[PDB]
Design a protein around this motif. Structure first.
Motif, short mmCIF file in Angstrom:
data_model
loop_
_atom_site.label_atom_id
_atom_site.label_comp_id
_atom_site.label_asym_id
_atom_site.label_seq_id
_atom_site.Cartn_x
_atom_site.Cartn_y
_atom_site.Cartn_z
N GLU A 51 0.82 -1.21 0.00
CA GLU A 51 0.00 0.00 0.00
C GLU A 51 0.86 1.26 0.00
N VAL A 52 0.95 1.92 1.15
CA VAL A 52 1.71 3.17 1.24
C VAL A 52 3.05 2.97 1.93
N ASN A 53 4.12 3.42 1.27
CA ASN A 53 5.44 3.46 1.88
C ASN A 53 5.84 4.89 2.19
N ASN A 54 6.60 5.07 3.27
CA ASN A 54 6.97 6.41 3.70
C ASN A 54 8.47 6.54 3.93
N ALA A 55 8.98 7.74 3.73
CA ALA A 55 10.38 8.04 3.99
C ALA A 55 10.49 9.42 4.62
N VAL A 56 11.33 9.54 5.64
CA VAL A 56 11.45 10.80 6.37
C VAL A 56 12.87 11.34 6.31
N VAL A 57 12.98 12.61 5.93
CA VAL A 57 14.27 13.29 5.88
C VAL A 57 14.16 14.64 6.57
N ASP A 62 22.69 20.93 6.93
CA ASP A 62 22.97 19.80 6.06
C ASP A 62 21.74 18.90 5.93
N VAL A 63 21.92 17.75 5.29
CA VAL A 63 20.82 16.82 5.09
C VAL A 63 20.94 15.67 6.07
N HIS A 64 19.84 15.35 6.74
CA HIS A 64 19.84 14.28 7.73
C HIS A 64 18.74 13.28 7.42
N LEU A 65 19.13 12.15 6.84
CA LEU A 65 18.18 11.10 6.50
C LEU A 65 17.83 10.30 7.75
N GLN A 66 16.53 10.10 7.97
CA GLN A 66 16.07 9.27 9.08
C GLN A 66 15.99 7.82 8.61
N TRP A 67 15.13 7.57 7.63
CA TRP A 67 15.06 6.25 7.00
C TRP A 67 14.48 6.35 5.59
N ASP A 68 14.98 5.51 4.69
CA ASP A 68 14.51 5.49 3.32
C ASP A 68 13.34 4.53 3.15
N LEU A 69 13.06 4.15 1.90
CA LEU A 69 11.92 3.29 1.59
C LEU A 69 12.24 1.82 1.85
N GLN A 70 13.53 1.48 1.79
CA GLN A 70 13.96 0.10 2.01
C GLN A 70 14.06 -0.22 3.50
N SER A 71 13.81 0.79 4.33
CA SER A 71 13.81 0.64 5.78
C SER A 71 12.54 -0.05 6.27
N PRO A 72 12.64 -0.83 7.36
CA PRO A 72 11.47 -1.50 7.95
C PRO A 72 10.39 -0.53 8.41
N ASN A 73 10.77 0.71 8.71
CA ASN A 73 9.82 1.73 9.13
C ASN A 73 8.88 2.14 7.99
N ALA A 74 9.37 2.01 6.76
CA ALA A 74 8.64 2.46 5.58
C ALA A 74 7.35 1.67 5.34
N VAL A 75 7.31 0.44 5.83
CA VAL A 75 6.16 -0.43 5.58
C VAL A 75 5.30 -0.67 6.81
N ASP A 76 5.82 -0.33 7.98
CA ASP A 76 5.07 -0.51 9.22
C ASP A 76 4.61 0.82 9.81
N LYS A 77 3.31 0.89 10.10
CA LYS A 77 2.71 2.11 10.63
C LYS A 77 3.16 2.38 12.07
N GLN A 78 3.03 1.37 12.92
CA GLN A 78 3.35 1.49 14.34
C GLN A 78 4.83 1.78 14.57
N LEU A 79 5.68 1.23 13.71
CA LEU A 79 7.12 1.46 13.81
C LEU A 79 7.49 2.89 13.41
N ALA A 80 6.94 3.35 12.29
CA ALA A 80 7.21 4.69 11.80
C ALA A 80 6.66 5.75 12.74
N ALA A 81 5.47 5.51 13.27
CA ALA A 81 4.82 6.47 14.16
C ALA A 81 5.60 6.62 15.46
N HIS A 82 6.19 5.52 15.91
CA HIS A 82 7.01 5.52 17.12
C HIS A 82 8.38 6.14 16.85
#
Ligand SMILES: *[C@H]1O[C@H](CO)[C@@H](O)[C@H](O)[C@@H]1O
Length: 240
Positions: A51-57, A62-82
């Motif tokens: 469904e929906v994948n997310n990425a946060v930067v 400078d640029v600070h990447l939190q996690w990309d699309l290949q990250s486990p957070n990208a596919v899990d709602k509860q993980l990303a929200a936490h």
């Protein structure tokens, strides 16, 4: 049972690059409300593997990447929200340019193996600074003419204004205004009953054509969603 996907008028398959300003011009006090803003935001979005994948930067000097699309957070709602609740704050200047350059990379070059061509979306968040940078930076130009979408929220049509207090109020019309730009996938019929043996084949049929969304820029490609053969095919096969 949706808000930004499915039957409402726009596709579930979608990738998001959250681009959050972390400059000193917002202060650390208001930055805490931003994380609270994103927390309840991800709760709404139908974040799933298919469904929906997310990425946060985040970005400042400078640029600070939190996690990309290949990250486990990208596919899990509860993980990303936490995970958004645990993001650090770094003072400094405001580098939106390389921030959009970073989002462009994650969306178009850093997609999960299945879905590179799905509608890309940038949901940026700025303050009183860089109101035009979401129109000026060449990266913003390059994303839109690849079928990408850029959303901006200035605090203090795809441009949305809001205050620090009424931040959560901006979520509802934002997903509404996004769904206009988004395409709609083809409406597939329900599956037929399984065949006997030898192997077992079930079939379905495409009802209506995929409705392409509204193009972002003048004279540039728009996302067009996926047909029924792109959703899994008209036919599925199992053994018996
Ligand atoms: C057919 O496939 C499954 C049924 O198990 C669902 O995704 C849906 O009902 C579709 O019509």
């Amino acid at each position: 049972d949706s808000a930004i996907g499915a039957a409402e008028g726009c596709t579930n398959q979608l990738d998001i690059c959250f681009l959050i300003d972390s400059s000193g011009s917002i202060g650390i006090q208001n930055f805490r409300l931003v994380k609270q803003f994103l927390h309840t935001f991800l709760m709404v979005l139908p974040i799933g593997p298919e469904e929906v994948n997310n990425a946060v930067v985040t970005y400042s000097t400078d640029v600070h990447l939190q996690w990309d699309l290949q990250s486990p957070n990208a596919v899990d709602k509860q993980l990303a929200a936490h995970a958004v609740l645990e993001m650090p704050y770094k003072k400094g200047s405001t580098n939106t340019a390389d921030g959009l350059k970073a989002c462009k990379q994650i969306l178009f070059t850093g997609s999960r193996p299945g879905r590179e061509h799905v509608p890309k979306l940038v949901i940026g968040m700025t303050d009183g600074e860089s109101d035009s940078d979401f129109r000026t930076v060449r990266a913003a130009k390059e994303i839109r003419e690849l079928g990408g979408i850029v959303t901006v929220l200035a605090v203090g049509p795809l441009y949305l204004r809001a205050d620090w207090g009424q931040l959560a109020t901006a979520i509802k019309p934002m997903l509404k205004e996004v769904c206009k730009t988004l395409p709609q996938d083809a409406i597939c019929s329900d599956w037929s009953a399984w065949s006997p043996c030898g192997s077992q084949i079930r079939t379905r049929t495409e009802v209506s054509a995929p409705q392409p969304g509204t193009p972002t820029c003048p004279d540039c490609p728009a996302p067009m969603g996926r047909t029924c053969v792109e959703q899994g095919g008209l036919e599925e096969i199992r053994e018996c």
